[PDB]
Amino acid sequence: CPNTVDCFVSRPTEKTVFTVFMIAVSGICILLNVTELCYLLIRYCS
């Protein structure tokens, strides 16, 4: 590409909406697995 070339992405807003949705649900799955560690640890901590 000579010098800097401008390029345009297809459906950037729709892709951002689904990107946020996947990230948020994955973050929930992280929390729902940390609590299971807490429930398992208190059994072996107390």
Ligand X SMILES: CCCCCCCCCCCCCCCCCCCC(=O)O[C@H](COC(=O)CCCCCCCCCCCCCC)COP(=O)(O)OCCN
| Residue ranges in contact with ligand X by CB under 6 A | 12-13, 16-17, 20-21, 24-25
* DSSP 8-state code for residue 11: S
Q: Is 4 in the site for a copy of itself (CB under 8 A)?
A: yes
The item of ligand X, a copy of itself, none sharing an interface with residue 4, based on CB under 5 to 8 Å by kind, is a copy of itself
How many CB atoms within 10 Å of residue 13?
7
Instruction: Choose the one of ligand X, a copy of itself, none that binds residue 6, judging by a C-beta under 5 to 8 angstroms depending on kind.
Output: a copy of itself
Number of H helices, E strands in the chain: 1, 0
In whole angstroms, give the CA distance from residue 16 to residue 34. 27
User: Which residues here bind a copy of itself, judged by CB under 8 A?
Assistant: 2-6
